Design a protein around this ligand. Structure first.
Ligand SMILES: [Mg+2]
Ligand SMILES: [Mg+2]
Ligand code: NA
Lengths: 358, 358
C-alpha cells in the first residue's frame, strides 16, 4: 500500500503507437523535489490515442481499458500526448481533449490534473530527465556529458548538455536547476522522422526489404542495407536538414555517453539481433541488419522467426537508425550506444514527476 | 429499380481518408463490354477502412454505416482498397479482410465478389479508364493524348499513353483492348506522396503555413509558397526521384490534355481559390496559395473563413501540387490542368465496371 505512505501520481504517455499509464510512488527532499521514485503500476494499450475516432463512446472504451484495473485509483493524473497528436491541427485535437475531460468527470476516483499535447522540445527535456534520473547522474555535477535519443513512431528526440547560446532558438534550449545543480540542455524533436512516418516513404524501396518480400506496388524486395540507408539519409538530410542542425552543436559540445530509448530498445533486444551489455554500435547494427534480414529470402526468414510482427521491417529499421545517428547526428559508427532494456518500462514520464516540482 | 432491367454492380473505393460506395447500372455492347454506365447510388463515410481497429464490432459498425440504407441491394459487390491499406503489411491487412469476409457471409442483401487491396498501378489504370469513359474518348481512336493524375491521401498516380516498351518494368505498363481499340498506358503510383503522408514531413516548416500559424513544435508560420514548394520538391525528387522517373517518359510521349481527380478538385473548388471552367494552371495555383493563404495572418484568415477544415493546409497544398506537377512531373507552369468537379463523384471505380470484361 505505497500511496498511504508516499506521494503518488499517475502519468500517461499517450504516444503515437499506444498509451502507457504509470503510477509512481515517491518521497521528496528538503526543496519538495521528488526522490526514491518507484513505478508501482504500469499498463500499456494500443493503438495511439490520436488514431481513434474522437467521440463519446470510443474515448470511454479506450480510457476504461487504460485505467479500470489500476490497483489504486484516488490519485492525481497527468495525461500528456506526444507526436501522434502533434500530427493533428489544434481544432481537431480539441475534440479528443473535450471528450477526455468529460470521461474523468463521470467518475470520482481519478483526479485529472492536466491532459494536453506537449511539444517535442518538452518531450526531449523529459526524455533527458528520465534517463539521467535512472542513471543517478542528476544529484551531483557530472564530469561527463550524457546525451539521450528517443526513437518514437512519429518523432525522434535528441537532447544533450549545451551552454546557453543566444544564436539558437530559445525553443531548443532549456535551463533547469535540480537537486541544487544548474543544467543547460539543447533539445530537438524531428516530427515525421519517427519509425512509422518515415517508413511510409520507403515501402516500395526494394533495398529496404528482404529478398522476395512482396512490396505493396508489386515489385520484390532485394535488400541491401547500405543502399537502403542512403535512401533514408536523403529524407534525414535533404529534407529535414538533420546534419546541418545537429552536427555543429555536437562538434562543439561532445557527448561522452549516449543512451537511447524507444523502438531501438525493442529491435536490439529481439531474437534477430545480438548485442551484449544492453549496448550497440551503429556499425554492428547495420551489418547485422544487412546479413540477418536484408540479404535473406523473405519466406524462409518469416518461417524461421514466426513470433515477431516487426520482422519484415528490420532491414529498413537497421538502415534507418544508422542513417539517423551516423549520417544525421554525425555520431561515429563505432561509438557505443546504450539502450535501456524494454522490460524496464522507461519512457519520459519520470521526467514529469521531477520537472513539475522545479 | 433499374437493376431489374439493367446489369448492376456495387464498387467501393476504400481510400486512405474514407470509403465511397457507388452502385452502377449499365448495359453491354456485343462483346459484353459495359455501356451507358450510370451511378444510381453513392454513399461516402469516414475515416479510411485501414484506420479502424479490425474486429467484429468495429467492422460491422463501419460496413453497416456504408451499406445499410442503399435503396438497392441483391447485387454483386467489389471492395477495393487503395493506399491506406498499402501502408500495412499483408499480415495486418489479412485481419481486416477476414472480418470483412465474415460480415458479408453473415448477411444476404449483398453478394461479395472480391475484397482486396489493389496496387497503385491497378488504381492508376482505373483512374485513366474512369476519366476517359466520362470524356467519351474510349470508343474511337484519338489524335490527342490524355494524361490523368489522381491526388490521394497516401499515394498519387499518374497515367498516360505510352507504346509498349521492353526497357520499362512490366508493372508500369498496361495494354488493354476496349471497344475494339488497343491502348497502351504507362502507370505509376507514388506511395508516401499523397497529401496526408507528405504533409507529415513539413508540419514544422514555417514557409508552409500562414503567418503566425502555431506550428506543433512551438515556432510560428511565416508563409512563402515558393519556399514551401522547394522544401516539398526535396521529398519529390531527392527522396522519390519523381523527376528522374517521369520526365524522360513525358518528353518522349507528350500529353496533350491533363485531367486531375482527388484532393486538388476540392481545393480548386473551395472558397479560397478562384478558377473558371473547372481548370487551373500551376502558375496560378501557386500565386493564389502564396497571396491568399501563405502571406496572410493566421488568426485573421481563420476568422474570415470558419467553415473550411482544410484552410490551415492550403499554403502547403498549393505548394505541394506545384512541386509534384511542375518539379516532379515536368509539367509547364502555364499548362492547363482540368480538374473534375467534386460534385460529380468521379473516382476510379467506373474503371472497375469496364475492366473486368477486358
Ligand atoms: Mg514515445
Ligand atoms: Mg483515392
Ligand atoms: Na506518414
Amino acid at each position: 500500500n505505497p500511496c498511504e505512505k508516499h506521494s503518488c501520481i499517475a502519468v500517461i504517455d499517450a504516444g503515437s503507437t499506444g498509451s502507457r499509464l504509470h503510477i509512481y510512488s515517491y518521497d521528496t527532499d528538503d526543496t519538495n523535489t521528488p526522490i526514491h521514485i518507484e513505478e508501482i503500476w504500469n499498463k500499456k494499450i494500443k493503438p495511439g490515442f490520436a488514431s481513434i475516432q474522437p467521440n463519446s463512446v470510443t474515448i470511454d472504451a479506450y480510457l476504461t481499458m487504460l485505467l479500470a484495473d489500476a490497483p489504486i485509483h484516488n490519485i492525481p493524473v497527468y495525461f500528456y500526448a506526444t507526436a501522434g497528436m502533434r500530427l493533428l491541427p489544434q481544432s481537431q485535437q480539441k475534440k479528443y481533449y473535450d471528450e477526455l475531460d468529460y470521461w474523468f468527470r463521470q467518475q470520482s476516483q481519478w483526479q485529472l490534473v492536466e491532459a494536453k499535447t506537449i511539444t517535442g522540445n518538452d518531450e526531449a527535456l523529459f526524455d533527458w530527465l528520465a534517463v539521467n534520473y535512472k542513471l543517478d547522474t542528476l544529484k551531483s555535477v557530472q564530469n561527463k556529458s550524457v546525451g539521450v535519443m528517443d526513437m518514437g513512431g512519429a518523432s525522434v528526440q535528441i537532447v544533450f548538455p549545451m551552454p546557453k547560446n543566444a544564436e539558437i532558438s530559445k525553443h531548443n534550449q532549456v535551463e533547469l536547476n535540480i537537486y541544487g545543480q544548474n543544467i543547460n540542455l539543447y533539445v530537438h524533436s524531428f516530427l515525421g522522422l519517427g519509425q512509422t512516418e518515415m517508413s511510409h516513404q520507403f515501402l516500395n524501396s526494394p533495398s529496404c526489404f528482404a529478398n522476395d518480400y512482396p512490396l505493396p506496388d508489386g515489385e520484390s524486395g532485394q535488400g541491401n542495407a547500405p543502399s537502403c540507408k542512403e535512401e533514408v539519409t536523403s529524407l534525414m538530410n535533404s529534407v529535414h536538414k538533420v546534419n546541418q542542425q545537429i552536427q555543429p552543436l555536437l562538434a562543439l559540445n561532445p557527448v561522452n555517453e549516449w543512451y537511447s530509448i524507444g523502438g531501438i530498445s525493442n529491435l536490439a533486444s529481439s531474437q534477430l539481433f545480438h548485442f551484449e551489455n544492453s549496448e550497440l554500435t551503429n556499425q554492428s547494427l547495420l551489418q547485422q541488419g544487412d546479413n540477418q534480414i536484408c540479404h535473406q529470402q523473405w519466406d524462409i526468414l518469416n518461417g524461421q522467426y514466426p513470433d515477431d510482427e516487426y520482422l519484415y521491417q528490420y532491414c529498413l529499421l537497421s538502415s534507418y537508425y544508422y542513417a539517423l545517428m551516423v549520417d544525421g547526428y554525425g555520431i561515429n559508427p563505432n561509438q557505443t550506444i546504450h539502450y535501456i532494456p524494454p522490460e524496464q518500462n522507461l519512457d519520459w514520464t519520470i521526467g514529469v514527476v521531477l520537472h513539475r516540482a522545479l
